[PDB]
Amino acid sequence: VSLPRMVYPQPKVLTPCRKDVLVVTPWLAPIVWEGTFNIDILNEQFRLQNTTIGLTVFAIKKYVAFLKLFLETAEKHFMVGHRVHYYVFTDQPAAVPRVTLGTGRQLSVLEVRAYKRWQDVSMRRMEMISDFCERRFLSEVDYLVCVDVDMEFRDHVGVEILTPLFGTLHPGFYGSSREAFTYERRPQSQAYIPKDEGDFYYGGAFFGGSVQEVQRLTRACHQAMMVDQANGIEAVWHDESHLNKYLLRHKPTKVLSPEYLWDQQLLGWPAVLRKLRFTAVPK
Amino acid sequence: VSLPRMVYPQPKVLTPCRKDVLVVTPWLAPIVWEGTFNIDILNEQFRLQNTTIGLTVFAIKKYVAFLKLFLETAEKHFMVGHRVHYYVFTDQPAAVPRVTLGTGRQLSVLEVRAYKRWQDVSMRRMEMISDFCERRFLSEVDYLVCVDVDMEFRDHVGVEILTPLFGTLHPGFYGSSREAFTYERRPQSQAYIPKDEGDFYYGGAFFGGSVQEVQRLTRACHQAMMVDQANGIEAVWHDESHLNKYLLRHKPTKVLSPEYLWDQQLLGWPAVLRKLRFTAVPKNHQAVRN
Ligand SMILES: O=Cc1ccc(-c2cn([C@@H]3O[C@H](COP(=O)(O)OP(=O)(O)O)[C@@H](O)[C@H]3O)c(=O)[nH]c2=O)s1
Numbered sequence: 313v314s315l316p317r318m319v320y321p322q323p324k325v326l327t328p329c330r331k332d333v334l335v336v337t338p339w340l341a342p343i344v345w346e347g348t349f350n351i352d353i354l355n356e357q358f359r360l361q362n363t364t365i366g367l368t369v370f371a372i373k374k375y376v377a378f379l380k381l382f383l384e385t386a387e388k389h390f391m392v393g394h395r396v397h398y399y400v401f402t403d404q405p406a407a408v409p410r411v412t413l414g415t416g417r418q419l420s421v422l423e424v425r426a427y428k429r430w431q432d433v434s435m436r437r438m439e440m441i442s443d444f445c446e447r448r449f450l451s452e453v454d455y456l457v458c459v460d461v462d463m464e465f466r467d468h469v470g471v472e473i474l475t476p477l478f479g480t481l482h483p484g485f486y487g488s489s490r491e492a493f494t495y496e497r498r499p500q501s502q503a504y505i506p507k508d509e510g511d512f513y514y515g516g517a518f519f520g521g522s523v524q525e526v527q528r529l530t531r532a533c534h535q536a537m538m539v540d541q542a543n544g545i546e547a548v549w550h551d552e553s554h555l556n557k558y559l560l561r562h563k564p565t566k567v568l569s570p571e572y573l574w575d576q577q578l579l580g581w582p583a584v585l586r587k588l589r590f591t592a593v594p595k
Numbered sequence: 596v597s598l599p600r601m602v603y604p605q606p607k608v609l610t611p612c613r614k615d616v617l618v619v620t621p622w623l624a625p626i627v628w629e630g631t632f633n634i635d636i637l638n639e640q641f642r643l644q645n646t647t648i649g650l651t652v653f654a655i656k657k658y659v660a661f662l663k664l665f666l667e668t669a670e671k672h673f674m675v676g677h678r679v680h681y682y683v684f685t686d687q688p689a690a691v692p693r694v695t696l697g698t699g700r701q702l703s704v705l706e707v708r709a710y711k712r713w714q715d716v717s718m719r720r721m722e723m724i725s726d727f728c729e730r731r732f733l734s735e736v737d738y739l740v741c742v743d744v745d746m747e748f749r750d751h752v753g754v755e756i757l758t759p760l761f762g763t764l765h766p767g768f769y770g771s772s773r774e775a776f777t778y779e780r781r782p783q784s785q786a787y788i789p790k791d792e793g794d795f796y797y798g799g800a801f802f803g804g805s806v807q808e809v810q811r812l813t814r815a816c817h818q819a820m821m822v823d824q825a826n827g828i829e830a831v832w833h834d835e836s837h838l839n840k841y842l843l844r845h846k847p848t849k850v851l852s853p854e855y856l857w858d859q860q861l862l863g864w865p866a867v868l869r870k871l872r873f874t875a876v877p878k879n880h881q882a883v884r885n
């Protein structure tokens with residue numbers, strides 16, 4: 313796309329703003345931290361493409377209680393100025409709160425089965441997103457962002473995250489060496505990653521990409537989980553373990569910093585985080 | 596694409612290698628410097644896609660003299676391990692020197708007209724690349740890389756540069772403020788950029804991208820030059836001025852550091868350059884008077 317004239321501060325080749333963190337992966341994907349992007353430029357780029365972003369969130373059984381704060385804060389902070397389609401997957405369509413939406417934003421309630429086992433609720437998100445990629449998303453949105461519901465937006469989360477495939481650094485482990493990552497370590501599981509492999513430990517609560525890439529990721533993870541199930545094994549961190557195996561072998565084209573997936577009660581507000589954008593609500 | 600198990604040092608989130616330079620633009624395009632990339636990973640990614648790279652170079656009039664060292668050093672340093680097509684445009688096909696190529700690398704020579712004015716030889720590269728894309732001469736590769744011929748490969752230039760659209764930081768201006776950039780400053784020119792705009796000054800001697808993006812860029816720059824011609828205007832730095840206007844409005848998805856476009860005889864070898872990959876060769880004797 314062709315941008316109009318814009319007035320903004322010139323980038324300085326010899327004076328980077330972030331010197332305290334890694335801002336690009338070894339496969340040349342940016343790692344998104346505050347200070348690395350000019351949102352005015354990116355906003356104009358994505359508006360000129362008429363971008364629609366889908367946001368998927370599961371609110372099943374007791375978790376429907378989190379929806380009100382999740383959606384109201386999403387209206388203040390998520391992709392503001394862009395076309396947004398919320399996909400709320402729930403077993404209680406009647407319990408979805410009436411949240412007032414900004415212009416250009418819409419919400420669809422998708423009714424789904426609640427699995428008894430909390431691990432199955434978390435893990436079967438992969439199957440449901442994969443199925444809906446086909447049923448709906450492919451014809452409705454350009455990008456999908458797939459997140460946990462037990463969360464609130466506190467600061468900007470915008471088109472800087474958009475790319476064919478992204479994962480997010482887990483807030484617990486961004487400073488950890490690969491040997492300490494809680495990857496699945498049993499070779500009997502499809503999620504197995506040995507101790508001398510791994511780039512990052514990605515959080516299962518925030519990933520996304522193009523519809524095509526997300527369809528592929530979620531289908532792959534679901535299949536891997538089904539194979540494990542038939543072999544009587546379940547990965548240590550469920551869907552997140554499979555997400556990690558997938559992103560090790562299919563490198564993300566952007567990686568989000570833990571600004572995008574945080575828990576302030578458990579981890580505070582470290583100096584390397586200039587903004588806390590999307591944060592846990594006590595569960 | 597799905598990679599196999601690989602063993603390499605873990606990237607450290609709290610410990611960047613390059614702290615002395617900007618390694619990502621404000622629109623989140625990487626700026627490619629030594630230390631930012633693991634070429635083992637990138638080679639695997641690109642080979643899994645069976646990537647073919649086309650390298651276009653113009654050697655018109657006395658510039659055929661540059662071909663021998665250009666092609667020999669490309670054999671040593673450019674995209675080694677990947678399929679490469681050299682597309683050499685010349686007015687003297689019989690003057691293209693014999694150069695032995697590695698497996699999977701192919702030379703195609705095409706005869707083209709020699710414009711009288713050197714400015715025109717340089718500028719008309721955009722029209723020629725655009726036309727030969729459209730005619731399916733240049734379109735059957737995955738990426739096109741478009742360079743000057745008066746150059747030598749000195750170190751690795753590989754798939755770390757590939758992306759839908761890339762420009763390269765010109766060696767004379769990487770540390771300069773935007774008001775110092777030698778953009779076309781006449782409002783009457785299509786290449787006009789005023790003093791309060793501009794991200795970088797990109798060099799006309801090294802740009803590229805996917806076939807689709809290179810087709811679009813070269814067609815756009817050619818049409819802009821034709822509009823200027825009809826208005827009786829020739830931009831200050833010719834095709835480079837239009838390239839700069841194009842990349843200001845269509846941001847590149849990677850930007851190459853000056854490691855990739857240098858002149859050591861003129862500028863030395865400053866500390867910020869850990870490698871010099873593609874460098875100018877003296878060209879005073881190859882000049883022709885308009
Ligand atoms: O009592 C234990 C539970 C663990 C997960 C449960 C669950 C999760 N979910 C969805 O799965 C996501 C992941 O579960 P979680 O937030 O509890 O997991 P983590 O924050 O540890 O990753 C939630 O954000 C919801 O979107 C539900 O909708 N209903 C639920 O009952 S219930």
Ligand SMILES: O=Cc1ccc(-c2cn([C@@H]3O[C@H](COP(=O)(O)OP(=O)(O)O)[C@@H](O)[C@H]3O)c(=O)[nH]c2=O)s1
Nearest residue numbers: 653654655656658713716717743744745882883884
């Ligand atoms: O006598 C003055 C000349 C200036 C350019 C000339 C020219 C350039 N070219 C091509 O245009 C490119 C740009 O010209 P250049 O390398 O001389 O200019 P710079 O952009 O490095 O200043 C060259 O690398 C060649 O590919 C030719 O093939 N033949 C030429 O006679 S001749």
Ligand SMILES: CCCCCCCCO[C@@H]1O[C@H](CO)[C@H](O)[C@H](O)[C@H]1O[C@@H]1O[C@@H](C)[C@@H](O)[C@@H](O)[C@@H]1O
Nearest residue numbers: 482483484485488494515516549552574575578592
């Ligand atoms: C060396 C650091 C040692 C300390 C690490 C502290 C955070 C641990 O985090 C858990 O990590 C697990 C994987 O190993 C799962 O991702 C789990 O869902 C996550 O807890 C979730 O995310 C957390 C951030 C909290 O919000 C917790 O309530 C959630 O259940």
Ligand SMILES: CCCCCCCCO[C@@H]1O[C@H](CO)[C@H](O)[C@H](O)[C@H]1O[C@@H]1O[C@@H](C)[C@@H](O)[C@@H](O)[C@@H]1O
Nearest residue numbers: 765766767768777798799832835857858861875878
């Ligand atoms: C004193 C600080 C500003 C000047 C700093 C030193 C380089 C100047 O560079 C010229 O810059 C022009 C645009 O302003 C054109 O790109 C020209 O082609 C280029 O010269 C080309 O590239 C050069 C590097 C040399 O190889 C020269 O011989 C070439 O003709």
Ligand SMILES: [Mn+2]
Nearest residue numbers: 460461462517
């Ligand atoms: Mn959660």
Ligand SMILES: [Mn+2]
Nearest residue numbers: 743744745800
């Ligand atoms: Mn040159």
